[model samples]
Target: MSSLPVPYKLPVSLSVGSCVIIKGTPIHSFINDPQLQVDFYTDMDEDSDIAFRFRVHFGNHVVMNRREFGIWMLEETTDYVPFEDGKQFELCIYVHYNEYEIKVNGIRIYGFVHRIPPSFVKMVQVSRDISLTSVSVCN
Candidate 1:
């Protein structure tokens, strides 16, 4: 995905079993390489270590990756991409001790095993392709 001009910041630290809920609508207009990026980070800084990187490529596929020490790990792809162009969605990411359980539009979609402790993630960023209406972290 292209560099994010703006990224939403989570209001609180995520705890085990807590869920980060995101509500947004994909842009109706064409975006050459449209993608939605949801990143869990160690800090608010864009360059901070990422515990998880979830990307939905509207033009292609959905993938998960990790970024540590400025290097991206191997990418993992799921068989499904629930997001539709020009549609609204509610995405929930549940924090777990060992993994993150993700749901798109209330349907469970994927799980990404943690490469780092979930508590290390101090920020959650949502960017690209969509316009967010609301974002919150709840226990």
Candidate 2:
């Protein structure tokens, strides 16, 4: 699992009660301002609609948004960061009836309302400045 490549992409179909789990460590120290992103896409292509997108600016904040019809929507942000410098963190996105509950290292961080049906998500892409350890989908 540690050998998983950056910008990792996995095919998926999410439903209520589904959970997407990701474990990784930032590739750089907090001072260097690394970032990690996860996108639930409607298609395998990056240009397709995104059901949900989560971005973390190490030591700064978490931003969540969605893209529809190739346009990005309003962003939701939180300043609470549960990750430590030079540490591996567990990120979980739980699909709910109307939203996705996001947690960092088991602590609830944000909940993004569904802009598009989770079942329409056909791909999950994890990208940016992190050394990916593992990714899994559970129901």
Candidate 3:
């Protein structure tokens, strides 16, 4: 069974051309300060590093960041706010040779360049403020 809500681990590793699709709606519980994080982990280690961090701060903005060896690198944010409070959105992260192409509600929104090799990602964690409907990783 797939783990929904926060912190979902993939059944298989992500590869080039594979798409990671997350469908969910923002939780009403968090109201004013809604937020969520979609994290790609290198391993299940005690100090597992994040290959990519996709964060949504509802009504505020969206940010993409990276962490290496316990250090969070620079953050990347877009002026576009694609998430709506209490509404459903479909997020797609398509793996490419050099980057991840992220789409919101079937529209391309942002891209995060690969800092860590895509193959190193072994786990995925989705957390906070949203109730997941489905999560899939497919080619």
Candidate 4:
């Protein structure tokens, strides 16, 4: 996703069980990466939970999760759940007092291990086979 540029910036702090849809930018057409993916987090000391669900590629696959820890890393979980190639999907993250839940395209996809800690997640990057259509961050 060399040409992947976000139309907007998403916040860092992720609350438990929240959801946001990803959108593409004007440069979306030029993106030629493996797939589009979004990663985000707030500058808080993360002591809350996280959760969300998503379904992409018309339900060819989906990801959902919830877990403890304020920090996490976005990882490549599958290739079978391929992005729409040129389509934007939804990305929802849920936050709890001590856990997190992840959702992609309305389907629960993953729960991660908080290895880094929440406050460390100060930047959000969008890369991979899809584009970000829209994103939201909540405390």
| lDDT of predicted model 1 | 0.83
In the order shown, what is each candidate's alpha-carbon RMSD?
3.8, 1.4, 2.3, 7.6
Give a tens-digit lDDT track for model 4, residues 1-139. Answer: 5433542334554433443445453224443423333444333233444332122322244333332455433533433453354455455555544544555566765655444454445545554344444556663
Question: Candidate 1's residue-wise lDDT over 41-133, tens digit each?
Answer: 898888989889999887577889999989999999986777877778899999877789999888988989888888888888888778788
What is the C-alpha lDDT profile of model 3 across 42-138, one tens digit per residue? 8876378999999888877798998887999999998676787778889999999999999988888888999978988888888888888898889
Model 3, which residues run further than 4 Å from truth? 1-5
Clashing pairs in 2: none
Please report how far candidate 3 places residue 11 from its true position, in Å.
4.8
Clashes of each: 0, 0, 2, 71
Which candidate leads in TM-score? 2
Worst 10 residues of 4 by lDDT: 50-59
Of 1 and 4, the candidate ahead on lDDT is 1
| lDDT preference between candidates 2 and 3, better one | 2
